[PDB]
Nucleic acid binder design. Sequence first.
RNA 1: CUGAUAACUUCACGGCGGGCUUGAUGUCCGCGUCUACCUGGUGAACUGCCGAGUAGGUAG
Length: 175
Amino acid sequence: MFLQRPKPYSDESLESFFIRVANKNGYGDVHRFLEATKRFLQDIDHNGYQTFPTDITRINPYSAKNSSSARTASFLKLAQLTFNEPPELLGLAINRTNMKYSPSTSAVVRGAEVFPRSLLRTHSIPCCPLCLRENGYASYLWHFQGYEYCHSHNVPLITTCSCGKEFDYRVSEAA
RNA sequence: CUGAUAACUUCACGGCGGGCUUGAUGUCCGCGUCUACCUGGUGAACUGCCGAGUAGGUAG
């Protein structure tokens, strides 16, 4: 109950929304609040709590074959009665759709926009600091957006970016 | 359009007498049934009042 001051702005792929509510009040990673959400889904007046995920990934509402209709219903009351001033939460969800293209590639709706195929990277992506955080990575071609020369693969020592290993995917002119 | 055409078989009645199936008998020996199993009431018919009362009544 009462997640204090949902702040955020647009242009986000919903994964740092749980990270920004993780860095407040003093909490480790997202396994606690993520269990306390699915515990609250296991609490009063709910029917579909069993399939709400467990890990860093898979908060995505197309990662299950048939919990897609359960994930949005999970995401319905995950904004209303748990936030003062319930924010723009719904619509950030990268869903799936019924549309296709002509070369038989699966269409995928974010809030109004369609990616070419639901394959693009899904793993081992670059990342740049000093925002919170992006909408456009884990895709084929979205690199810099104004400030350039920022690939940031972490061959040197641990904890270069100051976030706390939540999103932080790093392992050890016409563009 | 028939081996064609027609056609009363009827009346009467005592089966009876007698009678010992018997004697004897050993069905026995042996025996591993077992392994694995979800029945599924969400919150849902809630709170008083009189009477000594696990009886009885009485409210919205």
